[PDB]
């Protein structure tokens, strides 16, 4: 068997090739206890990784080792990898090849260090490095389409017409859910609720996943919200306090299409789709219009596809038809596609050998993997 | 004859337009007796506000109507304004427009209430509500520069470039002098000194304002402070008993840079100032580096500018020259900057009219004030 | 066989490690005669210590060497510890390490002095000082919660989450049983019973332990007590006189909740616990709500747990359930709590060796103890 690990900005999954569901589901955060140990009865480990931290997240300094799809802290990163293989997946890395996924347009130092770690720390028999978004299209059973990946650190748009994607039309935007989490909280201060620390940030993360939704008409909906009622919902905080949120339910998800609220000049997520498809050939444009695919945990908002379809329709000429594909389980499409690719017999020749890494060092990843 | 009143968490200043110093300088506390009156000859009142409470603070239960720049008691909030206009200023607000100040990132209901109460209880001709940090730069006379307003309850930092503000890069810290009073009082106990009641907070407020100071190198100093007694200073309490403080003189202001002592996970004032300008783009960072402005009564500490310039120098690139602007009168910069705005001829068009408030209501302030 | 010695503000407990109940249980008092011995010297010592003073308390001048958890006389204290080893436990202390309990937030001068003398007078092989509240949780066998340790001199609440204590949220209240006796010392004069001297105060200490109790609601009980005599209780004086006390039975324990009757600006113990838990993180508030640990001889009153639960529900959100842990043997919870630590093999590492004190001095206690 071959192991599939898909490191994400906030959420990392792992499982086995051919499986329909990832085996391990825990967020990728390592925290260190700011307070001093008083009791000696228990272990009181130096650090905690994954679901272990969130259980005790009140007394930990939660840190995200990867930011915008870039591993800022390599010292913490191996802690997740060690935890994945021995605690969650409880398997020995030196018997099975493992595959890792990355966002496009990443620094060369990001994806050279992981190969060094894999062949020196865990001594995996083989390795592979594959773009995050391209694997999502495999999960949908298509090879000609454009994938709208939107996770926590990267929102990259890539058109894929054949078995390989076009690098020249890859547009990467650093606007994702984590920026959204930073955005509702500053707006949430308008209603009298203050959340500053990283511990309450996950509490902030929860409310977005449950109550935030995309409004079809932002101008009409805000006018509707001016009349009060019929939209405010009550949410219970882990403390026990119940909070009510009004217009902010749609305002934060709306920032995807109008980034002017967050203060960066890049256009909305609807607009960058149009730019990418302009950069490709005219003949391939027709196919990509009808094969638009959404992916990533950000795209989970209710009605996001309907508003997306409306926006691109205005920008696109009426001759070509736009069909947006939103599979129900697009949350794990990146991993699921990797399981299919790992299960393929043709892929036995695109593995990287340990001996081959020795001859070329960690620089072999640029030339072989893509 | 516009009125310039800048209500603060602990200190409020009231004066007239076109002047150089605030007319009325009294503490912002409303207190009520905890006992029952015995002598009927003396005309006991119900509650006492301002310096009158400070005179009889040993018998009253002092309470701050404003906490963290937020009015938690609107009933008491009217009382202080009632005392300002008719006792301190001795003028009628019905014929002059009045300008009011507030910290950024405050709940909209807070500024909603102030407009309603002043237009309905005092019935002024006009109002304008403006950010405290914004008014600070006017006193300096500059047009671009990062302003660090560390008041009593709110520590906020706002970048400005050529008169254009950046709402996204505004950072607010809820750590200011009042918290330092709480930190100073817990660290005085190790020498054997107990201060618990609210009346005993003011005496602690007095001790920091004269003896506490900022040390350039904290790590160097405690070894010096623990090796001799030259740093010890003697202070006399109003009851005649005399106080000696050693290493605690620099330790309390050190919490402004190391909030881990207070248990807060926020970054230090030097770090937050660095963090705020990192949120800004590269182009204005050079100019904003050379125009750092400090304000608020917390920044009164001797040697604070030398420590802040040293701390930012390590974080900032070595090529840049960091310039700390510390005008000697920066305690009253917010009010003095307010005197300029009320005296400006262009500002007369941005006054909120009674007719404008009549047709819309308290909600007019949100679209008419920043 | 490590030695556990617990110096309390009103009551000292000592015993051996690994036991279940303290071996020697005698009061913490040192008194001296105020008269002259007309008869020959058949053993009239200079001072009497322990239960010996209690037997002849009518002739001596009882003075507590310990006050509010602070040693006000280091001379009389050496007497109790000298008497403890050679008269109560009958063991030489030069062969076994000794444990001590100190209340939080105490001056550094107190804890350095107890160490200096014991390494010099009794020459103990090893030493350690632990928080009273910390050991209380150990007796309960739990790992997370807030402990209410209200003894004779001090009332301190220390919250812990999973073996980590938050130093910032430690609230120290100078309201305990000795003050409650003083409040009884003032209110019992209404019925004609007049007590003056400190020796006569011990009788008041007895009546509170037998007749005083916590009423479920003060307002209805005072109305009921003023309408009937069902709450009357008869107490016999040592001389043979009998006394009757009515409404005052519940009034004294009520003062722990409304210290306004004593004039203290501090708040009730129910409110103080609320402040501490609010000061804690939001993520950990859920766990500590159901894990409130009660300790100290002050809370021996019948119905205190039922009352204590009631106000917390009023202040806290109704969604959360409230549980008050009240073990029957919470009186010596600190001692049995300290007993198990001495039996732990892990704790043997953190012993303060004699050489460590020699090479450092009395300053080692601050670094090596929390």
């Amino acid at each position: 068997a071959a192991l599939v690990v898909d490191n994400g900005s906030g959420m990392c999954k792992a499982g086995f090739a051919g499986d329909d569901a990832p085996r391990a589901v825990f967020p990728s955060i390592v925290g260190r206890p700011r307070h001093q140990g008083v009791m000696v009865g228990m272990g009181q480990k130096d650090s905690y990784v994954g679901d272990e931290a969130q259980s005790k997240r009140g007394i930990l300094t939660l840190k995200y080792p990867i930011e915008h799809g870039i591993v800022t802290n390599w010292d913490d990163m191996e802690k997740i990898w060690h935890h994945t293989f021995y605690n969650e997946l409880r398997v020995a890395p030196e018997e099975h090849p493992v595959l890792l996924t990355e966002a496009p347009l990443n620094p060369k130092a990001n994806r050279e260090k992981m190969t060094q770690i894999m062949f020196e720390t865990f001594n995996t028999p083989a390795m592979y490095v594959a773009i995050q978004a391209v694997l999502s299209l495999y999960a949908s059973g298509r090879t000609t389409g454009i994938v709208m990946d939107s996770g926590d650190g990267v929102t990259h748009t890539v058109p894929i017409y054949e078995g390989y994607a076009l690098p020249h039309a890859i547009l990467r935007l650093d606007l994702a859910g984590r920026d959204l989490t930073d955005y509702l909280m500053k707006i949430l201060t308008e209603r009298g609720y203050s959340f500053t620390t990283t511990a309450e940030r996950e509490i902030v993360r929860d409310i977005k996943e449950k109550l935030c939704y995309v409004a079809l008409d932002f101008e009409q909906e805000m006018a509707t919200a001016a009349s009060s009622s019929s939209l405010e919902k009550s949410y219970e905080l882990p403390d026990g306090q119940v909070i009510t949120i009004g217009n902010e339910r749609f305002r934060c998800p709306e920032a995807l299409f109008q980034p002017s609220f967050l203060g960066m000049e890049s256009a909305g997520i609807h607009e960058t789709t149009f730019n990418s498809i302009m950069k490709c050939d005219v003949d391939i444009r027709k196919d990509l219009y009808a094969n638009t695919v959404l992916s990533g945990g950000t795209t989970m908002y209710p009605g996001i596809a309907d508003r997306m379809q409306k926006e691109i329709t205005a920008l696109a000429p009426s001759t070509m038809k736009i069909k947006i594909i939103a599979p129900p389980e697009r949350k794990y499409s990146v991993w699921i596609g990797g399981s299919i690719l790992a299960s393929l017999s043709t892929f036995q020749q695109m593995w990287i050998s340990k001996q081959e890494y020795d001859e070329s060092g960690p620089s072999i990843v640029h030339r072989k993997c893509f | 004859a516009a009125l310039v009143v800048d209500n603060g968490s602990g200190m409020c200043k009231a004066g007239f337009a076109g002047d150089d110093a605030p007319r009325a300088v009294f503490p912002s506390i409303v207190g009520r007796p905890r006992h029952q009156g015995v002598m009927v000859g003396m005309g006991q009142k119900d509650s006492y506000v301002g310096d009158e409470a400070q005179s009889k603070r040993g018998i009253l239960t002092l309470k701050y109507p404003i906490e963290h720049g937020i009015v938690t008691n609107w009933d008491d909030m009217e009382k202080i304004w009632h005392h300002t206009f008719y006792n301190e200023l001795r003028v009628a607000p019905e014929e002059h427009p009045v300008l009011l100040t507030e910290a950024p990132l405050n709940p909209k209901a807070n500024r909603e209430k102030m407009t309603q109460i002043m237009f309905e209880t005092f019935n002024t001709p006009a109002m304008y509500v403006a950010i405290q940090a914004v008014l600070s730069l006017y006193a300096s006379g500059r047009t671009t520069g990062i302003v660090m307003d560390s008041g009593d309850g709110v520590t906020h930092t706002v970048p400005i470039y050529e008169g254009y503000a950046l709402p996204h890069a505004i950072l607010r810290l809820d750590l200011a002098g009042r918290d330092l009073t709480d930190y100073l009082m817990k660290i005085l106990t190790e020498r054997g000194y107990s201060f618990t009641t609210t009346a005993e907070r003011e005496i602690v407020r007095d001790i920091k304002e004269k003896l506490c100071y900022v040390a350039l190198d904290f790590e160097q100093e405690m070894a010096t402070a623990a090796s001799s007694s030259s740093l010890e200073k003697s202070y006399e309490l109003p009851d005649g008993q005399v106080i000696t403080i050693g290493n605690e003189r620099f330790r309390c202001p050190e919490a402004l840079f190391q909030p881990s002592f207070l248990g807060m996970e926020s970054a230090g004032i030097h770090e937050t100032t660095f963090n705020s300008i990192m949120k800004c783009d590269v182009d204005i960072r050079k100019d904003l580096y050379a125009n750092t402005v400090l304000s608020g009564g917390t920044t009164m500490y001797p040697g604070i500018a030398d420590r802040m310039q040293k701390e930012i120098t390590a974080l900032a690139p070595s090529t840049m020259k960091i310039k700390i602007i510390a005008p000697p009168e920066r305690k009253y910069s917010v009010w003095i900057g307010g005197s300029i705005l009320a005296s400006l001829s262009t500002f007369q068009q941005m006054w909120i009219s009674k007719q404008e408030y009549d047709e819309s209501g308290p909600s007019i302030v949100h679209r008419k004030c920043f | 066989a490590a030695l556990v010695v617990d110096n309390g503000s009103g009551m000292c407990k000592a015993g051996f490690a690994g036991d279940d109940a303290p071996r020697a249980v005698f009061p913490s008092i040192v008194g001296r005669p105020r008269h002259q011995g007309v008869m020959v010297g058949m053993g009239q010592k200079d001072s009497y210590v322990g239960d010996e003073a209690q037997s002849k308390r009518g002739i001596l001048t009882l003075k507590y060497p310990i006050e509010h958890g602070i040693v006000t006389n280091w001379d009389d204290m050496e007497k109790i510890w000298h008497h403890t080893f050679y008269n109560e436990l009958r063991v030489a202390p030069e062969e076994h390490p000794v444990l001590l309990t100190e209340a939080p937030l105490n001056p550094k001068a107190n804890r350095e002095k107890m160490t200096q003398i014991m390494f010099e007078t009794f020459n103990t092989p090893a030493m350690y000082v632990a928080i009273q509240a910390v050991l209380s949780l150990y007796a309960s066998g739990r790992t997370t919660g807030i402990v209410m340790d209200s003894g004779d001199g001090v009332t301190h609440t220390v919250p812990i989450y999973e073996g980590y204590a938050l130093p910032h949220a430690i609230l120290r209240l100078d309201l305990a049983g000795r003050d409650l006796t003083d409040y009884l010392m003032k209110i019992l004069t209404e019925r004609g019973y007049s007590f003056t001297t400190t020796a006569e105060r011990e009788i008041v200490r007895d009546i509170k332990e037998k007749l005083c109790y916590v009423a479920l609601d003060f307002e209805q009980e005072m109305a009921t007590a003023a309408s009937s005599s069902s709450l009357e209780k008869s107490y016999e004086l040592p001389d043979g006189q009998v006394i009757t006390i009515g409404n005052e039975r519940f009034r004294c324990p009520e003062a722990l909740f409304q210290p306004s009757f004593l004039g203290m600006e501090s708040a009730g113990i129910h409110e103080t616990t609320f402040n501490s838990i609010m000061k804690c993180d939001v993520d950990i508030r859920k766990d500590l709500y159901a894990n409130t640990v009660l300790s100290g001889g002050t809370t021996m009153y019948p119905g205190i747990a039922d009352r204590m639960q009631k106000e917390i529900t009023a202040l806290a959100p109704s969604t959360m359930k409230i549980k008050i842990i009240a073990p029957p043997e919470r009186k010596y919870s600190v001692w049995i709590g300290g007993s198990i630590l001495a039996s732990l093999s892990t704790f043997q590492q953190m012993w303060i060796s004699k050489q460590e004190y020699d090479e450092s001095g009395p300053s080692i206690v601050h670094r090596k103890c929390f």
């Binding site: 209603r191 203050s194 959340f195 909070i243 | 937020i70 709940p107 | -």
Partner: peptide, 7 residues
Amino acid sequence: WXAXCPA
């Protein structure tokens, strides 16, 4: 504040 801090 209502949720978070005391204000």
